[PDB]
Design a protein around this ligand. Sequence first.
Ligand SMILES: CC(C)CCC[C@@H](C)[C@H]1CC[C@H]2[C@@H]3CC=C4C[C@@H](OC(=O)CCC(=O)O)CC[C@]4(C)[C@H]3CC[C@]12C
Ligand SMILES: CC(C)CCC[C@@H](C)[C@H]1CC[C@H]2[C@@H]3CC=C4C[C@@H](OC(=O)CCC(=O)O)CC[C@]4(C)[C@H]3CC[C@]12C
Ligand SMILES: CC(C)CCC[C@@H](C)[C@H]1CC[C@H]2[C@@H]3CC=C4C[C@@H](OC(=O)CCC(=O)O)CC[C@]4(C)[C@H]3CC[C@]12C
Ligand SMILES: CC(C)CCC[C@@H](C)[C@H]1CC[C@H]2[C@@H]3CC=C4C[C@@H](OC(=O)CCC(=O)O)CC[C@]4(C)[C@H]3CC[C@]12C
Ligand SMILES: [Zn+2]
Lengths: 93, 537, 179, 80
Amino acid sequence: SIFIAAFTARFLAFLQATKAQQYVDSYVQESDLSEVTLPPEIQYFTYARDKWLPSDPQIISEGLYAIAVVLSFSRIAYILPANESFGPLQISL
Amino acid sequence: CMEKQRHDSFSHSRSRINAYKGLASPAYLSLSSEDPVLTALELSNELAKLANIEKEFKNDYRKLSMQCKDFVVGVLDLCRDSEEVEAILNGDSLSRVKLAIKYEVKKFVAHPNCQQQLLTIWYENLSGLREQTIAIKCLVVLVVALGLPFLAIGYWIAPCSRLGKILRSPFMKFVAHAASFIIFLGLLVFNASDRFEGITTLPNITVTDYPKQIFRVKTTQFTWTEMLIMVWVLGMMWSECKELWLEGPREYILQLWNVLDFGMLSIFIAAFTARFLAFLQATKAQQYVDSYVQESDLSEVTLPPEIQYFTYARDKWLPSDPQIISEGLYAIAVVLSFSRIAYILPANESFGPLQISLGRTVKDIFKFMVLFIMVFFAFMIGMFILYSYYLGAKVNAAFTTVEESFKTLFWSIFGLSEVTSVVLKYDHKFIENIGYVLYGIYNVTMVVVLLNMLIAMINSSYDDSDVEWKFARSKLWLSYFDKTLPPPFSLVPQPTRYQQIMKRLIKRYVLKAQVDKENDEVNEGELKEIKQDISSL
Amino acid sequence: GRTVKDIFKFMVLFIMVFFAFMIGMFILYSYYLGAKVNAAFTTVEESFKTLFWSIFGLSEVTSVVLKYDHKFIENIGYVLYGIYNVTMVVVLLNMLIAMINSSYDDSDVEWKFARSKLWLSYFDKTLPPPFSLVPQPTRYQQIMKRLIKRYVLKAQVDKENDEVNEGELKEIKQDISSL
Amino acid sequence: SLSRVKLAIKYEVKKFVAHPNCQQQLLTIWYENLSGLREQTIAIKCLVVLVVALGLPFLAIGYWIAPCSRLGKILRSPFM
Ligand SMILES: CC(C)CCC[C@@H](C)[C@H]1CC[C@H]2[C@@H]3CC=C4C[C@@H](OC(=O)CCC(=O)O)CC[C@]4(C)[C@H]3CC[C@]12C
Ligand SMILES: CC(C)CCC[C@@H](C)[C@H]1CC[C@H]2[C@@H]3CC=C4C[C@@H](OC(=O)CCC(=O)O)CC[C@]4(C)[C@H]3CC[C@]12C
Ligand SMILES: CC(C)CCC[C@@H](C)[C@H]1CC[C@H]2[C@@H]3CC=C4C[C@@H](OC(=O)CCC(=O)O)CC[C@]4(C)[C@H]3CC[C@]12C
Ligand SMILES: CC(C)CCC[C@@H](C)[C@H]1CC[C@H]2[C@@H]3CC=C4C[C@@H](OC(=O)CCC(=O)O)CC[C@]4(C)[C@H]3CC[C@]12C
Ligand SMILES: [Zn+2]
């Protein structure tokens, strides 16, 4: 559920970003987007990591993703019983 | 065997166990064939190998091998004469003692009947040196170490001399090797002399004896003691190769301690191979300056860019210079060099059993070390992933790279790392607070694994302690029985009389075993006899 | 006191491992006296200081970094120092385990023997050190014989009380053989 | 089907499951369709894990034809 929560936030960020991408090509016509003064909502997605909101879906995604990777290696507990040397070692743990 | 294996394999294993239980019976062992102690030792070894192979009835085969070991030690124990002891320790050179060491029969080697035969061989040609205090023997080691070269040249005339017999004794061989090793460690310490109180000049300054020379030739030349260390290292490397050829490459890598020792000398060779390479290039530039450019002082000369490189100081040296490769490998070797005391500490009485407990815990740590690695690698990857996108945003570059994540997590085990590695300069609390949660989870986990490691080792601990040290020291003794000079000085080029003793001892074992069986059955046997008397009358 | 005696044996071992890295670490960094940020392993006296306080964790981990771009020297310093730290934990853990095993009314009698030595020093030291500057067999042989008879009797009694069944069964068998 | 072994696991009768009479019946089921792989060293089994990991996709597509194939029986063993 943490892993799903990591990618659900990631997928949500994809929908909004391509929405702003669909806006720029549709209405504002220029060779370079930098010289354009975009609408404040559309111009938000042109910002870097510095200007991102604290509760951005991508930030929610990255933290949940890292937690999942920490828990992912906890699945070795399903395999260590078979090993003879590491078998009883796990039981005491 | 295949037909028996096809159906009812459980009964097949049960039959094999029963047959070996019959073979490993003390009664059958004693009455089965001549020389039952050798038969018992071989059968015990076979049972131990089968216990390794089966991995299902391991306790049964360990019990049977224990029965064989008990029979061997019991047959040895009943000896009351030295001739019986000699016959048991070697059949028709300690033949049986060496074969018992190979088969891990520790109670046989450590038995008081067996030890007293080894000490007489060990302390040969010198009787009064066994009664000396440890300080006097320490004084002897100091005396031998100081006067080692003087007696070495006298070894050529030693075979005619009386003092050669004293030198050739196993204890004087051990003293020679212990004194020789002290000398080698002294050489490394003495090779670091004049830097005990620091270097005298800063690395930014180039100092040369005469202006025409190149600076690198001054630094890369071999001093007299450093040539003496290479000869010491070459002698040890020659000895290792000879043992490798005789024993074979497969058996050589089997011992983990042997792998540790061989790599140590290969490190030392790797240290001086890089050092020698730097000497060749430096003198090449030295040969260039005197040959072509003619001046009184080399400083005023604008040299070719290749030749002018070797005139630089430590500052301008390349990162992968052969001398830098040499220095790091050399330091590693010195750390491993003091690990050779493990060959000498078994002899010491006070430090003997101390070492045995040290080795036992190290074996357990490797198992936890693998577990420590798995938990370590979990957060190492986990923490590295989270912070890899805040390389410039983080105040401290701790988890920015996978190499950096390994460093900060390892030193956290010893508490040498900071807790401010999980804070950001951006206003992203979700990323930062999750970093606290994971790092706090990691720290509690390593304590749990360390605490579990401490508890498991204590349980693994439990005259069993005493006999295991005497078995380790006995292996040390037997290496010197049949290695004359130290490695530095090694470069110069009707039944029988036996079958009567065995029969007498085996009769004694059968009698005592029957006596101890019937002495435990005095009441049961007597009550049956009187009942038959009542039935008769 | 009992643990202190054991520590001395490990203290010698602690010294041998300590002196191994003390010489090993000192050799590596003695040529970067000015290049190192912290003069930790520049001298053999300095190498003894930084390694000793590491046992109590009072020393830094930045003692193995250089201001020169020589990673081979620096990374080897990390490897040795990390190897040293794991080793001292192993020796300390082994020290803790060995002491626990060495522990085992034996505990009670050993204290009373130590206190009894303290008592007997005062039986036959009058004033404190500050104030000390001013200047037929026998009646015995009857008791011993009576006690030794008691010991032989009880030892025979305890031996025969443990052998009541064995002795009785032998006597009845002789009766059967007689008749 | 080990009717009583499963019922003993549920009821925590550890000495019944771990008895040498009981274990040897389980290992024969575990190491089925491959006899020589029980006698291999742990490194060889580690090599087998490395071999299987690298060639896992190639044998996966062969599982459709495996029921007719002999190598499908090896794949379907509990150890594999
Ligand atoms: C049995 C299975 C299907 C349970 C799976 C549960 C998830 C489908 C739910 C539970 C918690 C939910 C998450 C709670 C927190 C967030 C943060 C949220 O971030 C924001 O939208 C705020 C920023 C913004 O968009 O303005 C994005 C949705 C997400 C991932 C939610 C997505 C849907 C989640 C993962
Ligand atoms: C690069 C490494 C140092 C980082 C950590 C990786 C480990 C967490 C992974 C990688 C390979 C894995 C190993 C691959 C091989 C096996 C075989 C398997 O054990 C057995 O062979 C069972 C015994 C049997 O077959 O009868 C599972 C444990 C183990 C050691 C695995 C344990 C987890 C390991 C060590
Ligand atoms: C059984 C015995 C004989 C094994 C001994 C192995 C050595 C002879 C080999 C193994 C690794 C080799 C070393 C690998 C690394 C280096 C670094 C290398 O440094 C460089 O030459 C790069 C810098 C430069 O010269 O431009 C010098 C050779 C050296 C010491 C090699 C020398 C030869 C070594 C020590
Ligand atoms: C300057 C010191 C404090 C730094 C560390 C040096 C030690 C690692 C070396 C130097 C002298 C060595 C000792 C010299 C004398 C001996 C005799 C020898 O032990 C025996 O006497 C064996 C018993 C016997 O002879 O029957 C080997 C251990 C020991 C203590 C050596 C152990 C290793 C020692 C202490
Ligand atoms: Zn056969």
